[PDB]
Amino acid sequence: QQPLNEEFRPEMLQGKKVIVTGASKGIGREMAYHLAKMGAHVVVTARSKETLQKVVSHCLELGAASAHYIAGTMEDMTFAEQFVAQAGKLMGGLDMLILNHITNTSLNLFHDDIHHVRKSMEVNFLSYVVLTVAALPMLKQSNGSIVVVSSLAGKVAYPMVAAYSASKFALDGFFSSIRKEYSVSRVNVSITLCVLGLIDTETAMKAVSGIVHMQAAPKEECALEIIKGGALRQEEVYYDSSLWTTLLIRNPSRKILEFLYSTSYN
């Protein structure tokens, strides 16, 4: 996909119909707040209505054109399928789909917890695919954008996050493949893979305390960069405190192997 070769302006999100999953707290909540100041229409989701309501309250206050919430579990594919239709109904269409939610996880050595491995695949990966299917028709109509929020754990290998790593790796695998398919089918829907480092969210901070020690980037700026990358139709976003990360994490060998062997099949 070709990104919009121009500078980001907040006016790009004005009146834009956006979905934010995992938006009751952390990066999701921060993304909804950014989209509210921009005068966008937001539909937010998580399981907890109480925390979701509070987010909506601040969204309307901040100046969202409209702000709504729908609670449910991304463990349930029916909910996922329905939420998109419901969200679409409320905004009267869809421009951007931000897939951000993840199953609750902890830094632990993997032993025998297949239930968790399965849950991670269903919530962190499978549900993103169901949400993409439900939203693709509306996105085609608006020449919209799919925004996939991933991690450095979905580009390189880390211990204590095997089930998580696997789910995030699958997002790259799937989404990077449909991006190639959208190019050939001439489907004008952009796909942004967001590769994030450690962010100062309540959840991350509690999980990493004592176990891991490294700088945690601000969630406010993290969210803006995810929205920026999405609006500019960038294939990939890299966000982290360190700057070796950013530069080293890109894979030119991968892009050759992809391109210099793309035009080698009819």
Ligand X SMILES: NC(=O)C1=CN([C@@H]2O[C@H](COP(=O)(O)OP(=O)(O)OC[C@H]3O[C@@H](n4cnc5c(N)ncnc54)[C@H](OP(=O)(O)O)[C@@H]3O)[C@@H](O)[C@H]2O)C=CC1
Shortest Å distance, C-beta 48 to ligand S05: 15
Whether residue 165 is annotated as binding a ligand: the answer is yes
Computed over its alpha carbons, how large is the radius of gyration of the chain? 18
Annotated catalytic sites, by residue?
164
How far, CA to CA in Å, does 193 sit from each of 49, 188, 226?
A: 28, 16, 9
Shortest Å distance, C-beta 214 to ligand S05: 6
Shortest Å distance, C-beta 153 to a copy of itself: 8
DSSP 3-state assignment of 89? helix
Q: Does 179 bind a copy of itself (CB under 8 A)?
A: yes
Nearer to a copy of itself, 59 or 134 (CB): 134
Residue 253 neighbours by CB under 8 Å, 6+ apart: none
Nearer to ligand S05, 198 or 231 (CB): 198
Stretch in the footprint of a copy of itself (CB under 8 A) among 16-24, 35-43, 65-73, 173-181: 173-181
Shortest Å distance, C-beta 106 to ligand S05: 7
Q: Does 8 bind ligand S05 (CB under 6 A)?
A: no
Shortest Å distance, C-beta 139 to a copy of itself: 13
**CA–CA separation, 200 vs 262, rounded Å?**
39
**CA–CA separation, 70 vs 86, rounded Å?**
8
Query: Are the C-beta atoms of 74 and 125 separated by less than 8 Å?
Result: no
Q: Does 26 bind ligand X (CB under 6 A)?
A: yes
Site for ligand X in 206-235 (CB under 6 A): none
Query: Are the C-beta atoms of 36 and 63 separated by less than 8 Å?
Result: yes
Q: Does 88 bind ligand X (CB under 6 A)?
A: no
| Inter-residue long-range contacts of 83-92, CB under 8 Å, 24+ positions, other chains counted | 83/45, 83/131, 83/134, 84/19, 84/131, 84/134, 84/135, 84/138, 85/134, 86/43, 87/19, 87/43, 87/45, 88/17, 88/135, 88/138, 90/41, 90/43, 90/66, 91/17, 91/41, 91/43, 91/66, 92/17
| Nearest position to ligand S05, beta carbon | 151
Q: Does 74 bind ligand X (CB under 6 A)?
A: yes
DSSP sequence for 143-160: T-EEEEEEEGGGTS--TT
Site for ligand S05 in 151-170 (CB under 6 A): 151-153, 158, 160-161, 164
Query: Are the C-beta atoms of 2 and 34 separated by less than 8 Å?
Result: no
Whether residue 166 is annotated as binding a ligand: the answer is yes
Q: Does 42 bind ligand X (CB under 6 A)?
A: no
154: Cα separation from own chain's centroid: 13
Count residues binding ligand S05 (CB under 6 A).
18
Whether residue 32 is annotated as binding a ligand: the answer is yes
Whether residue 31 is annotated as binding a ligand: the answer is yes
Q: Which residues are annotated as a binding site for NADP(+)?
A: 22-48, 73-74, 100-102, 164-168, 199-203
Give the residues lining the site for ligand S05 (CB under 6 A): 102, 105, 107, 151-153, 158, 160-161, 164, 197-198, 201, 203-204, 207-208, 212
Give the residues lining the site for ligand X (CB under 6 A): 22-28, 46-48, 51, 73-75, 100-104, 123, 149, 151, 196, 198-199, 201-204
Q: Which residues are annotated as a binding site for substrate?
A: 151
